[PDB]
Write an enzyme that holds these catalytic residues in place. Structure first.
Site, PDB file in Angstrom:
ATOM      1  N   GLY A  58      54.796   4.271 -13.082  1.00 49.24           N
ATOM      2  CA  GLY A  58      54.076   3.259 -13.870  1.00 49.24           C
ATOM      3  C   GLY A  58      52.611   3.611 -14.063  1.00 49.24           C
ATOM      4  O   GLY A  58      51.723   2.775 -13.905  1.00 49.24           O
TER       5      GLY A  58
ATOM      6  N   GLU B 165      44.478  19.197 -18.551  1.00 48.73           N
ATOM      7  CA  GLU B 165      45.725  19.687 -17.924  1.00 48.73           C
ATOM      8  C   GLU B 165      46.722  18.542 -17.730  1.00 48.73           C
ATOM      9  O   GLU B 165      47.929  18.765 -17.786  1.00 48.73           O
ATOM     10  CB  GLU B 165      45.488  20.428 -16.597  1.00 48.73           C
ATOM     11  CG  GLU B 165      44.867  21.817 -16.739  1.00 48.73           C
ATOM     12  CD  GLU B 165      43.357  21.805 -16.826  1.00 48.73           C
ATOM     13  OE1 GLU B 165      42.737  20.710 -16.786  1.00 48.73           O
ATOM     14  OE2 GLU B 165      42.779  22.917 -16.932  1.00 48.73           O
TER      15      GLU B 165
ATOM     16  N   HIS C 260      42.215  32.991 -14.663  1.00 51.53           N
ATOM     17  CA  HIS C 260      43.217  33.234 -13.623  1.00 51.53           C
ATOM     18  C   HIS C 260      44.623  33.421 -14.179  1.00 51.53           C
ATOM     19  O   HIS C 260      45.462  34.060 -13.534  1.00 51.53           O
ATOM     20  CB  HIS C 260      43.289  32.057 -12.645  1.00 51.53           C
ATOM     21  CG  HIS C 260      42.173  32.023 -11.654  1.00 51.53           C
ATOM     22  ND1 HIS C 260      40.875  31.706 -12.005  1.00 51.53           N
ATOM     23  CD2 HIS C 260      42.166  32.225 -10.316  1.00 51.53           C
ATOM     24  CE1 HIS C 260      40.117  31.726 -10.925  1.00 51.53           C
ATOM     25  NE2 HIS C 260      40.875  32.040  -9.889  1.00 51.53           N
TER      26      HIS C 260
ATOM     27  N   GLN D 215      37.208  28.407  -7.388  1.00 52.56           N
ATOM     28  CA  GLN D 215      38.540  27.829  -7.634  1.00 52.56           C
ATOM     29  C   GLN D 215      39.567  28.079  -6.527  1.00 52.56           C
ATOM     30  O   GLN D 215      40.752  27.774  -6.692  1.00 52.56           O
ATOM     31  CB  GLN D 215      39.094  28.296  -8.983  1.00 52.56           C
ATOM     32  CG  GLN D 215      38.539  27.529 -10.155  1.00 52.56           C
ATOM     33  CD  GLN D 215      38.869  28.188 -11.478  1.00 52.56           C
ATOM     34  OE1 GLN D 215      39.817  27.780 -12.185  1.00 52.56           O
ATOM     35  NE2 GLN D 215      38.092  29.215 -11.829  1.00 52.56           N
TER      36      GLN D 215
HETATM   37  C1  LIG Z   1      39.886  22.058 -14.849  1.00 54.31           C
HETATM   38  C2  LIG Z   1      39.645  23.442 -15.369  1.00 54.31           C
HETATM   39  N1  LIG Z   1      40.412  23.910 -16.416  1.00 54.31           N
HETATM   40  C3  LIG Z   1      40.193  25.199 -16.905  1.00 54.31           C
HETATM   41  C4  LIG Z   1      39.195  25.999 -16.359  1.00 54.31           C
HETATM   42  C5  LIG Z   1      38.978  27.397 -16.919  1.00 54.31           C
HETATM   43  N2  LIG Z   1      37.687  27.536 -17.606  1.00 54.31           N
HETATM   44  C6  LIG Z   1      36.581  28.208 -17.091  1.00 54.31           C
HETATM   45  S1  LIG Z   1      35.286  28.229 -18.076  1.00 54.31           S
HETATM   46  C7  LIG Z   1      36.110  27.395 -19.222  1.00 54.31           C
HETATM   47  C8  LIG Z   1      35.399  27.097 -20.531  1.00 54.31           C
HETATM   48  C9  LIG Z   1      34.593  25.799 -20.542  1.00 54.31           C
HETATM   49  O1  LIG Z   1      34.179  25.583 -21.892  1.00 54.31           O
HETATM   50  P1  LIG Z   1      32.952  24.609 -22.208  1.00 54.31           P
HETATM   51  O2  LIG Z   1      33.057  23.362 -21.380  1.00 54.31           O
HETATM   52  O3  LIG Z   1      32.934  24.280 -23.664  1.00 54.31           O
HETATM   53  O4  LIG Z   1      31.696  25.447 -21.676  1.00 54.31           O
HETATM   54  P2  LIG Z   1      31.150  26.811 -22.364  1.00 54.31           P
HETATM   55  O5  LIG Z   1      31.529  27.969 -21.470  1.00 54.31           O
HETATM   56  O6  LIG Z   1      31.672  26.966 -23.740  1.00 54.31           O
HETATM   57  O7  LIG Z   1      29.624  26.662 -22.407  1.00 54.31           O
HETATM   58  C10 LIG Z   1      37.428  27.074 -18.859  1.00 54.31           C
HETATM   59  C11 LIG Z   1      38.424  26.324 -19.719  1.00 54.31           C
HETATM   60  C12 LIG Z   1      38.435  25.517 -15.278  1.00 54.31           C
HETATM   61  N3  LIG Z   1      37.488  26.261 -14.699  1.00 54.31           N
HETATM   62  N4  LIG Z   1      38.659  24.232 -14.811  1.00 54.31           N
HETATM   63  C1  LIG Z   2      46.987   5.126 -13.504  1.00 55.61           C
HETATM   64  C2  LIG Z   2      47.027   3.630 -13.371  1.00 55.61           C
HETATM   65  N1  LIG Z   2      45.847   2.929 -13.213  1.00 55.61           N
HETATM   66  C3  LIG Z   2      45.887   1.546 -13.096  1.00 55.61           C
HETATM   67  C4  LIG Z   2      47.108   0.875 -13.141  1.00 55.61           C
HETATM   68  C5  LIG Z   2      47.134  -0.632 -13.017  1.00 55.61           C
HETATM   69  N2  LIG Z   2      47.530  -1.288 -14.270  1.00 55.61           N
HETATM   70  C6  LIG Z   2      48.769  -1.854 -14.490  1.00 55.61           C
HETATM   71  S1  LIG Z   2      48.943  -2.541 -15.949  1.00 55.61           S
HETATM   72  C7  LIG Z   2      47.403  -2.170 -16.359  1.00 55.61           C
HETATM   73  C8  LIG Z   2      46.870  -2.598 -17.727  1.00 55.61           C
HETATM   74  C9  LIG Z   2      47.258  -1.651 -18.851  1.00 55.61           C
HETATM   75  O1  LIG Z   2      46.515  -2.062 -19.988  1.00 55.61           O
HETATM   76  P1  LIG Z   2      46.927  -1.547 -21.439  1.00 55.61           P
HETATM   77  O2  LIG Z   2      47.163  -0.081 -21.476  1.00 55.61           O
HETATM   78  O3  LIG Z   2      45.872  -1.874 -22.433  1.00 55.61           O
HETATM   79  O4  LIG Z   2      48.332  -2.286 -21.703  1.00 55.61           O
HETATM   80  P2  LIG Z   2      48.488  -3.893 -21.893  1.00 55.61           P
HETATM   81  O5  LIG Z   2      49.021  -4.449 -20.603  1.00 55.61           O
HETATM   82  O6  LIG Z   2      47.176  -4.516 -22.246  1.00 55.61           O
HETATM   83  O7  LIG Z   2      49.483  -4.085 -23.047  1.00 55.61           O
HETATM   84  C10 LIG Z   2      46.716  -1.483 -15.344  1.00 55.61           C
HETATM   85  C11 LIG Z   2      45.284  -1.007 -15.415  1.00 55.61           C
HETATM   86  C12 LIG Z   2      48.300   1.600 -13.283  1.00 55.61           C
HETATM   87  N3  LIG Z   2      49.503   1.020 -13.313  1.00 55.61           N
HETATM   88  N4  LIG Z   2      48.239   2.969 -13.407  1.00 55.61           N
END
Ligand SMILES: Cc1ncc(C[n+]2csc(CCOP(=O)(O)OP(=O)(O)O)c2C)c(N)n1
Ligand SMILES: Cc1ncc(C[n+]2csc(CCOP(=O)(O)OP(=O)(O)O)c2C)c(N)n1
Ligand SMILES: Cc1ncc(C[n+]2csc(CCOP(=O)(O)OP(=O)(O)O)c2C)c(N)n1
Lengths: 187, 555, 554, 555
Positions: free
Chosen positions: D418, D49, D28, D112
């Protein structure tokens, strides 16, 4: 045999069985008025888009059928929002056709443009969608009608950009579908 | 010392300096009504929430201050959406306060509940938010006000659930904040100011174009000093027009539409200083018909996305327009004498006169009163003591032709939304703001447009607001009928005629003074009389439909 | 007898019949973790909320039941949005429970607050709502469940503010409702059913095409009865494929893609009964390449908008697909004997065999393991005891070619979102569901796609989930690389090679069994061994990149 | 001379001054990849991404410039949503370019398509918009850039349908605009500046607190001049910290958290000048624990809503923080003679030293390596040549205690979202920006957090980006485990242990250098080795879990 998008709208409405529209005029939606005039389909034009919207609701409710409201871009649409909300909570089948800014003139701070009409209607419709191509008109009008008429009934917004409606296309290049949707509900 | 959420709302509005609200009653918002009652704060209650919303807009626009609209849950809110959208596109500071379903009764399929009001307002507000706790009311009302009043001005929605408003809390458990927000907006960096002024100095044919942000801050003294120092002619869109009223005639270019004829006169500006005038509907989009492609453009706007939106610019400055005018005045109060621009100002004057004379030469009232002649009758009465509000379509296009040579106290016309009917509420609100200023409000509207809010004659009478409503009656939705005839065909008129109804009769049935007129003499007499009394009035003016206004001819 | 909002959530889930949740911990949602601990309800905690969301999807899809995902405020929620979107387009019933900022601390610029989570989820959910009162929790949890499970199935977001969850209320002051929602879907009016059967009886070359709604209600006994009574061959999109597994070979048309070659063989169906199969990506859009324009179409779908969306239909029925299948079985158990369809069924079989043989004839592993050959190695092991999950792009397109011949217990592939990487979480959740089903889950994914959620090898090992992850490794984002070569030019490859990294080494570092293979023999041996033990495995399979799968061209 | 929409996108990015993109390929968006290829503009392609989005953020933050992320339709976009949300709350200027379904294939249930990507991004962007015509691409790309870069900075979503990108147009029919947007931010009205400075002069214990907007404009020369002239100590939230690195030690207050102990010491500031630091998580909300309720607060922010959000203020100025810093430097340049602040600066220094010494005295590595001790090992290497990126939870709380005494070239920590795990992509993009700066990037993350993006070791190797990833490994989601122990009970740990996996082994399997250490001596040796080599590295550090960081108790 070139016809406007507005002509496509009306041909699709006629095939669905629509015999009346309620609305208020604007240049943005003139192609629909002209097609209705040609096909002797009455547009009951009111003094406020709200009254036109509520009339489409009243027509639907009294006649147990689809109501069709027709409003122009910008304030045409915003004036119709109380009807949309009322039909939403009342489970009333109304197709709200609204004009909108031309796609080709997007983001030019122009007349009646720049209101995200689909976003405004989204919380209070079964479906709300802005048409992207003239050729999509008949299938999307019929899709909108199926959304409105199906259980539980409710309002739908189909937003039709000015350029999409003014665009002319070869009438033989697009099919006008039938309304193929069973009249008998599931049991 | 237990007080309601609604009392907290009103105490906060009072502390901010709000003196009027516009609205329509509902039980969901009664606590606000009761608090205003106690505090002697007037709520101007209308016959439609849309009129109340537009009234808050008109009050803000005419008054250069915050407008406040107050509406109930569900349909109260949805009826206010056109005002919200209009304020949004017009950059008008209005706080829309709406009721909504009680939080404790969420998802009970109950009365007026179930509309996601914040979601509906999100695309058309600077900020929209539903209050979650009674204790949050003062700080979130003040936050909302700061959002509406900051550059670029715009509408805010504060959604106040019924239980949140009825809930009572210790009045001492929460502080009511002051409105602590500088009155003086941010100004350009001095390097940018110097560059702008260097270009202005070097230009052969410089012009200034003011937009709505110039009106909101109303830095008239600074503007006067700047214009006197530089001698540069000043134009405006509709919303900026009243900002020209204190300038000498020589530097009043008037409405920016007047720039149209300049290129053919070999007189296109070589420099344009745009002060909150956006590229868009009023400035000729990106066509270069008003703002020439050959001109160097200096654009100052509080929204960076506007800068050169539709046209390449030379200098793009994000700053407040009022702050910028103050900065420009300060700089030009301490620099060298500026080039004399008398010849250029004279050319500006001559070209405007040529346009007006040309229209006058073509306009005839032989068989019916000509819209241009009707507009001239109004113009005779327009000065600093008058706010002119304009609605309709052909009606305002014609009216625009007489507005550059007069100096209105206020001029409120359609903005980008172009929503027929918004004028009645707008003018009603303007008249409330104009009271303290000793100004008289005149609405000039179409027969089509007046129908939207015609019940507001009732409100004018109930509130003794001496608004004069002038209906330019061509028995049609006029501009749309012209569209059909011109763009489609003479035999393709449908849904645009309105050959029914006595609007003066409607006004009279609501208790307002009604007049019906059809000539320069009759119209002049009616208007003179209506202006002589502090009474609401409706003047129904039969005018010709067929004449095409220059702005339509250009289109 | 004072209990938390989180305890209300969990009591309601239990009463609904929920036995597993997928998620990742946060303080905002700790009351739910604590309640699950008290009630012995497992929460399968992953290394990424996306993997947790996709696990809930996989559990729902493989198990034909509700999936429940549990994520914390802010990034917990935003990390779950790809699952929500995938579930949305796939019509998968997942309840997403998300924490959010405390209502009492609204607009304080505080931790994890200020994201309008419901607004973000609104375009991609059947329902999204933020709870305003602790007392509302049980009724709104149950409401959300009814929304997710009803036809067409789909994701729901229930947003639970931190203070709403931590608040304590007298347990006696709030009733925990039952899930009172009929297990039986609504059926067509008998007039419509009669017309459909009249058309089916008159047709010379009728086919049935199943979609996801058929898999959600899993009316296998009824489907078998209907198919045996009528002798009409049955096709499916990927999501409907496993619903063909209990049918006799003669009426198994397999994947709907197989209809492609019918028109050129003068054998285009003259009637197509679409049961929850939408017009769209998997059915040839409105091209008529699979569903012929010359055919009469009967379409049954719970969403009226879908009926004849891209093509004119003869009969459009809004009903539940499961209810309809039951209705059709009931009607054909009582009507006259149906016309013999042996010859048409054999034509269907021959055309499928001709496709398979043509690919077999063209495929060579002379210099590198060919993706078709690798796919055949997998197919050998596919039966009722297996769920196959497919990710990658070229990888699943090749795999699809061997799937119609076998009878998988489950088959979970990309739907309309086509989001590379969703397979790993999906397969982990599927393996949980598969435990009680007595099934083994095998993920077949690309080297690109596996990278999205590669940390989930950790989760497999921590939770002792014996998922087998097979990586078809062509050292590239393959389908995208083919796009560049085919649509742009051979010298225009950019951003699509992935010529680095030992995926089996990564799996081993997380404690999973790792294998690296490069031939039919080496791959066969590794897969056989992985299947012989209930241990998580990664099989890194070196395969050729150049071959173009039939579906890629089409 | 027929060119694609993708070619228009890239020509416009180049003209704006964009030198790198971060993304992940899809068909795309291939036209953009092909145009970048032709123009030798690197696209740093990641394994997720989300990592690409965070990398664009890290590039923007470390580089004080626009970050650009590029993702395909559907899952490309949805996978970028956490970056968008993080950038939103962090006020980080990132242009997210996303593919979407072709307009001509609307509503066909195709690959998509059907995700309302703009609606999803709307609550968490300054602007989000779907392009309707190929010829609009240059003006809308530039508009999106102006939106992102203007005060307060933030993310923008520009959604580019596949057909709009593939469509070919005559290159001479569409102009590619310049980025005409002043680099100089708007400044306060001089009356406000005079009042602010008069108050600052009068105060006995004034402090300045910098926020993220100070980092975005990086007016370091002006800040130094203003601070040299006034002698006022300067504090910062995490995002403002690196802006203190060039200041004299006497006026480095360091992290704003250090103000906690001041009131107890009878030394609460009497005036606080807040420059883009919002009332919220990093500044003690409205608690007055850092910004005293008794202090006169002067707050400067480009968003009026923020002014006194949670606390009453004395003076609320809407202006750009950079422009304000320039204005403050100018006003104090030829000012002389400001009050001596020696004793007050010494008190600030002493309170900081007391905190650090106290923590030192409570930290033992008798058995497992103490997080404070591990942090001190890192601090020895932190100076102007280093960017520190911090992820985890306990990990960064501990790290923060060593960050005020050092002078990092960059410091990029969690903001309001956070969101655990954002650090890897962030650090990767920072390392790209840092190549031009000549800085080494060090990510300090937790064992839990690193798992989110652990595939990015592949990217570091493929791209030869010498990021050093230090994993503080306490075998758990630590802060959440502390919550369970502290807020619920010792027997209530569930879902928070992570007692599996060799992270250094994972890094080695992706081709990065792996180290595993468990002591002050082993760690210091490993870090010296990693810094000596220009290679990506993973240092897996076994640290104690039980210690409670000061901020955990305060928070
Ligand atoms: C989240 C996301 N990012 C990017 C794409 C674009 N895209 C379509 S096919 C493809 C290749 C996937 O490669 P792989 O998982 O190794 O499968 P293969 O085709 O090599 O067997 C990508 C990146 C998508 N469809 N979805
Ligand atoms: C995306 C996301 N998922 C879950 C949480 C909840 N959360 C807050 S602190 C924490 C622990 C992080 O652990 P780590 O990365 O190992 O750092 P540490 O506190 O052990 O030093 C979590 C899961 C969050 N803040 N964000
Ligand atoms: C709310 C709304 N509805 C419809 C239109 C379309 N429209 C544009 S001009 C016009 C005619 C207005 O007629 P009138 O108010 O009588 O003014 P006239 O042009 O006749 O002077 C209409 C209906 C609009 N712009 N706004």
């Amino acid at each position: 045999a070139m016809i406007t998008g507005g002509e496509l709208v009306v041909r699709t409405l006629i095939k669905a069985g629509v015999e009346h529209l309620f609305g208020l005029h604007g240049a943005h939606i003139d192609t629909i008025f002209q097609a209705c005039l040609d096909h002797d389909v009455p547009i009951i034009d009111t003094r406020h888009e709200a009254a036109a919207g509520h009339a489409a609701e009243g027509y639907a409710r009294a006649g147990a059928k689809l109501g069709v409201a027709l409003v122009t871009a910008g304030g045409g649409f915003t004036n119709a929002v109380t009807p949309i909300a009322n039909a939403w909570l009342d489970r009333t089948p109304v197709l709200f056709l609204t004009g909108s800014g031309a796609l080709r003139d997007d983001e030019t701070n122009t007349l009646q443009a720049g209101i995200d009409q689909v976003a405004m209607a989204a919380p209070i419709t079964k479906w709300a969608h802005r048409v992207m191509a003239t050729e999509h008109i008949p299938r999307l009008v019929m899709q909108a009608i199926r959304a409105a008429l199906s259980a539980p009934r409710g309002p739908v917004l189909l937003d039709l950009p000015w350029d999409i409606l003014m665009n002319q296309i070869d009438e033989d290049s697009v099919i006008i579908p039938d309304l193929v949707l069973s009249a008998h509900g599931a049991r | 010392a237990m007080i309601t959420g609604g009392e907290l709302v009103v105490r906060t509005l009072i502390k901010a300096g709000v003196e009027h609200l516009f609205g329509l009653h509902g039980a969901h918002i009664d606590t606000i009504f009761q608090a205003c009652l106690d505090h002697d704060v007037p709520i101007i209650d209308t016959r439609h929430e849309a009129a109340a919303g537009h009234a808050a807009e008109g009050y803000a626009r005419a008054g250069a201050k915050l407008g406040v609209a107050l509406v109930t849950a569900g349909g109260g809110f949805t009826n206010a959406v056109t005002p919200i959208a209009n304020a949004w596109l017009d950059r008008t500071p209005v706080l829309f306060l709406t009721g909504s379903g009680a939080l404790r009764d969420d998802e009970t399929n109950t009365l007026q509940a179930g509309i996601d009001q914040v979601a509906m307002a999100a695309p058309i507000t600077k900020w929209a938010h539903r209050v979650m706790a009674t204790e949050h009311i003062p700080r979130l009302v003040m936050q909302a006000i700061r959002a509406a009043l900051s550059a670029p001005r715009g509408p805010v929605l504060l959604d106040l659930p019924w239980d949140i408003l009825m809930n009572q809390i210790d009045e001492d458990s929460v502080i009511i904040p002051d409105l602590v927000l500088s009155a003086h907006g941010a100004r350009p960096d001095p390097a940018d100011l110097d560059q702008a002024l260097a270009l202005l100095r070097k230009a052969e044919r410089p012009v200034i174009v003011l937009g709505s942000e110039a009106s909101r801050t109303a830095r008239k003294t600074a503007l006067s000093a700047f214009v006197a120092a530089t001698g540069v002619p000043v134009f405006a869109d509709y919303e900026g027009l009243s900002m020209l009223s204190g300038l000498p005639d020589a530097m009043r270019g008037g409405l920016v539409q007047n720039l149209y004829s300049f290129a053919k006169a070999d007189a296109a500006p070589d420099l344009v200083l745009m002060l909150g005038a956006r590229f868009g509907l009023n400035t000729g989009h990106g066509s270069g018909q008003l703002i020439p492609h050959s001109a160097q453009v200096i654009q100052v706007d509080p929204d960076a996305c506007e800068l050169g939106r539709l046209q390449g610019i030379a200098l793009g400055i994000v700053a407040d327009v009022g702050g910028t005018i103050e900065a420009l005045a300060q700089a030009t109060a301490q620099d060298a004498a500026w080039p004399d621009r008398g010849d250029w100002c004279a050319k500006v004057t001559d070209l405007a006169q040529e346009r007006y004379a040309s229209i006058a030469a073509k306009s005839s009232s032989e068989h019916a009163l000509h819209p241009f002649h009707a507009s001239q009758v109004i113009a005779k009465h327009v000065d600093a003591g008058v706010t002119v509000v304009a609605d309709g379509a052909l009606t305002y296009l014609w009216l625009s032709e007489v507005m550059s040579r007069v100096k209105p106290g206020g001029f409120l016309c359609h903005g980008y939304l172009g929503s027929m009917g918004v004028g009645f509420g707008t003018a009603l609100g303007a008249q409330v703001a104009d009271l303290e200023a000793g100004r008289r409000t005149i609405l000039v509207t179409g027969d089509g447009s007046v129908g939207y809010s015609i019940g507001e004659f009732d409100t004018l009478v109930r509130k003794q607001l001496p608004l004069i409503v002038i209906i330019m009656n061509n028995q049609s939705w006029g501009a749309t009928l012209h569209f059909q005839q011109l763009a489609v065909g003479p035999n393709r008129v449908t849904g645009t005629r309105l050959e029914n109804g006595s609007y003066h009769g409607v006004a009279a049935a609501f208790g307002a003074d009604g007049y019906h007129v059809d000539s320069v003499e009759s119209f002049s007499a009616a208007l003179a009389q209506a202006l002589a009394h502090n009474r609401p009035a409706c003047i129904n003016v039969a005018v010709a439909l067929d004449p095409i206004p220059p702005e339509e001819l250009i289109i």
